[PDB]
Fold this protein.
Amino acid sequence: DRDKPAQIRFSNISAAKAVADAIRTSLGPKGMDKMIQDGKGDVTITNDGATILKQMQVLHPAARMLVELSKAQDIEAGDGTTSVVIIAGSLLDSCTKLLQKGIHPTIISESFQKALEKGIEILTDMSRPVELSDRETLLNSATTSLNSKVVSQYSSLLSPMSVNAVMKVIDPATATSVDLRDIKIVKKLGGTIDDCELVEGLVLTQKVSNSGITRVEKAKIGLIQFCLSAPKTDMDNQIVVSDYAQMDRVLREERAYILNLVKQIKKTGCNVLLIQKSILRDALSDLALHFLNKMKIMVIKDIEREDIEFICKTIGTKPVAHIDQFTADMLGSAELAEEVNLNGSGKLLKITGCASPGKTVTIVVRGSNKLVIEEAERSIHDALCVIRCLVKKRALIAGGGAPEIELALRLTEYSRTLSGMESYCVRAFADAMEVIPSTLAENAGLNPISTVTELRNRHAQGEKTAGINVRKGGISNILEELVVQPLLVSVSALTLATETVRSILKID
Amino acid sequence: KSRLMGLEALKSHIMAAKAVANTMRTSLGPNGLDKMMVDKDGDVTVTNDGATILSMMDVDHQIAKLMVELSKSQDDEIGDGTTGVVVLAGALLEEAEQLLDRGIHPIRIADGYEQAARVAIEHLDKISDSVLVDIKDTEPLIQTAKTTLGSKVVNSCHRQMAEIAVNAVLTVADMERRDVDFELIKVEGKVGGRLEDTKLIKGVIVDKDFSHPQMPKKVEDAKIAILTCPFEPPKPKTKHKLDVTSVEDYKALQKYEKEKFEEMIQQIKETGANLAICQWGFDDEANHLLLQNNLPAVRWVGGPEIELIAIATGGRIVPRFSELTAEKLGFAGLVQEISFGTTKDKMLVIEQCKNSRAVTIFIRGGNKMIIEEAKRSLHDALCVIRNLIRDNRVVYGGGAAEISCALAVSQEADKCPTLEQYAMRAFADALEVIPMALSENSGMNPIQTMTEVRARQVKEMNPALGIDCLHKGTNDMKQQHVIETLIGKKQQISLATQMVRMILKIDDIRKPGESEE
């Protein structure tokens, strides 16, 4: 019998909401900051309850699906990560009614997967198609969501910078989802938010040039993945040294083989060299690097291992491990490589363009100090994601909790007109839909029960003539005062919870 | 002092309503599973009717104490449908918790429950056309009382019972502006013969007395002597002293009283009404002497039995032997004698073509247990026909009209889009609990059952095609012939929203230790 896994399910259904019920307060731009008590004990004022899930959580398998639920919303959208929490606990309320009714969870699973496919179809008709190749249409569509979000204090000047950034990788009108795996975020320690801009190719950190060039035209991007030293067990220079001759005879011979490997670099043609950390190897010999930099090659050193793997795929500098991999395809081809030392504190190397597949786009984040720099980082990336979610889903939907009240109004109607032993499941699926804007219409104030029934007063007759407007703090049409969102941040918040729900229904 | 505020009130309002709605939903329809009762005297009782059991169950809660008078209004007016008002109103009630758990205020839904009741009654005007002529509509009532008889008290439908029962009502309706009074009719049941035996009496019946078959067993002209005065020596249950001077004085006393027997004859017979009935009784000695003296007399008549024959005839009763007139005699249409049962004795059936003030269907039984179960099927069949004789409004209920208004009220939550939409939603989903409950107590899956006729509402609106509960696989309401009165279903709408309105009436839930104690 499934009676012992029956009790496991209701415990899992109850426990998944109980962590998610704190996010009901944290829902929306008028949502609540949630002060976190740490496992060692400390206060942490926190909003954006996906980050709360990453920070403080309990060890429960229904709760461990919740941190996975928001993480998928983080990587696919990055937005709607608070709303993706509230939809899943809303669906679990629908699950409790039907399991008490005596409906198999296999039935409740497949009914939700049908209604998910069915709801986004009707939601798409609610959406309006916007351009993805018109740069100006993308500008108006993005910043209205950016003014709809919390941070717009720096998103004003940083919206069109992101618009010009994505427009380079918008080659078709289809305009695929977006790789952020060519988008590099680069901090500059000084400078200004006004001086933040988009530098093509990739932007490097501190160079280490012994006698090397500063500005090389038509550079050759090289990679080094080999050591320049002796084996190490206790000492880098394994001598039992007490003598001047034994330290002279063996260490001049260490200079000998690194003479010949350095000459093979410049003869094959190299101007920019990618060197990882000397803890990612055993040692890197700077005297050979001095002789290398005396052969007029600009060199950076001490970069991360996986960060090179970002660089190799972005600018086409395919991995060079030895002398034999000195070729024309393993080496990238920059048009101009130089370092900018001025316009702000610090100094950052500029690979201004490279022979790159697609378009390698890099932003330089500036600011007074690190906290001011970190303000723009959320400001750019949220601006990057709202463009990213609109090029994934062509049409645009006005945001503000109203299309859920729209869609639940149709899905109750269609589930009656369709048929079903599972018709209750879809009609309970639609009853879960208006929970989330109701919990949003608590954070706006202005009683949500009185609120939510008067939006589908307008969604039934005029199909929308009033909305929930956090600008007004309540009843105002999201088409009257424009509150919009991409289509993806609503759909991706919707579909991941449905896939999560059908799993835990089938989970014993 | 403990106060159970709001939800804490409603949790007390859940548990009794949850109990009583669940015991009714196992009892809807001919697949309804029977209700067992042990009395306060410790007596086994098995019915399937709620208005019996709610009267018999010792109610112990404000919800439960309500249900006696709530089901009193349904059974006295409509009859059948005692279970459905309890299943429906509790299903709004348990959903109203979910709305209150959703945060929806209990007042704004109680406001909307009444408006949800309006649009359902509005829909019944469109459902199931209301014209059924007098000769024809007996036959669906012949079919309707076939359903009540042929599955509950007797497995194979006494045909003589359902056809007499539609005929007793036209006896009173014509004299009473196309309506019947339930004190002008009476479901009279006396076992002793055969359970197949069933008669219609336009008046009342009394057991006819004859003392010897050697003395003539008479029946004659259609006029009854409704008497309390002595035509035969009476007995008010006491004793004089007996004294005669001589034995030959008693020999002459038999010759003296024989002339006195003829004097009681020649007074009554010259006024008319040769069937003499006197209230107080006597032995069989001078009874067959009066039978020999050529007028029959009925002895040991019950007290109120002289009243019911008086109003059935419409005439009066003769109080004294010296006051003698025909207006104080019975005015009968037919006085004939038919044997009581098949084996014991005979009655004297006094029919009238004048006054239908007591029209009694007279049934017999071979079992004492079956007849009140038979009469309870006959009690509700005579109440539903009162709805039809006034207006011929009918409903195809049992699963057709339940899913039909559940479409409409849920649509009216969208057509009338405001705050009461969840109240209309709590009304609409609760309508689906009923044809679920006709299949829940049935062997069928009720989850499959709500699916089929829902697709039929996509096919056809205003259905005469709803589910079956005879497991014939033929889901109709006009070929399955499951048809009820539109007035009765509309009354069930009013009663169910009455109870939810009734438990909402004060905001007081405080006690001094004594509000249910």
Observations:
- The CA atoms of residues 415 and 423 of chain A lie 5 Å apart.
- Chain A touches chain B through 24 residues (CB under 8 Å).
